[PDB]
């Protein structure tokens, strides 16, 4: 139910600066981000439970990403999350700034949602940074391909059938989408 729409748009202007997106296509983008968030967080919760860890850190997010994402998508997602956490983790504690993670997706919002979901007793500061980076990376991949589909269709805005076609023709994204819903 949470809205990532503002951040989806920011990513859209990075990958396709002159391409719009309809309202209904943005709703589908938002649902995908929420679905991926919930699937990753749920697997991370199980990993912490079976490893007797009271705190979810970037370690469980990374392992969940490896269990869920296929192929090159997983390699890029792991690279993006690891990079964001390393940049965010300043040597001086209490001096952290979200801006250090280098992201468009909101670190603080993702932290609050992880805390709200009661996935573990505590959520470490690295977990939302890693997860926000993964959600942003997947958004960039989908918006890139959907925007290419719109451009090939001589459209200046992404509509729902561009998104569906872009996911369907990408073996790795199509596999991932099948695993975020029952």
């Amino acid at each position: 139910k949470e809205s990532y729409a503002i951040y989806v748009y920011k990513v859209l202007k990075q990958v396709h600066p002159d391409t719009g997106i309809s309202s209904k296509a943005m709703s589908i983008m938002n649902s995908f981000v929420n679905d991926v968030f919930e699937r990753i967080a749920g697997e991370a919760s199980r990993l912490a439970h079976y490893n007797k860890r009271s705190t979810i850190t970037s370690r469980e997010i990374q392992t969940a990403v490896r269990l869920l994402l296929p192929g090159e998508l997983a390699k890029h997602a792991v690279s993006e999350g690891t990079k964001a956490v390393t940049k965010y983790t300043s040597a001086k504690k209490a001096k952290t700034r979200s801006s250090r993670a280098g992201l468009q997706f909101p670190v603080g919002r993702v932290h609050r949602l992880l805390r709200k979901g009661n996935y573990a007793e505590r959520v470490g500061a690295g977990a939302p940074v890693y997860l926000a980076a993964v959600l942003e990376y997947l958004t960039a991949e989908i918006l890139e391909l959907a925007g290419n589909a719109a451009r090939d269709n001589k459209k200046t805005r992404i509509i729902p059938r561009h998104l569906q076609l872009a996911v369907r023709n990408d073996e790795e994204l199509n596999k991932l989408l099948g695993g975020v819903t029952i």
């Binding site: 729409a5 503002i6 748009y9 719009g20 997106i21 309809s22 309202s23 209904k24 296509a25 943005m26 805005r157 509509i159």
Partner: peptide, 10 residues
């Protein structure tokens, strides 16, 4: 705040 706009399509 200045929420960005998407709006219907065709």
């Amino acid at each position: 705040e200045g929420y960005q706009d998407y709006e219907p399509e065709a």
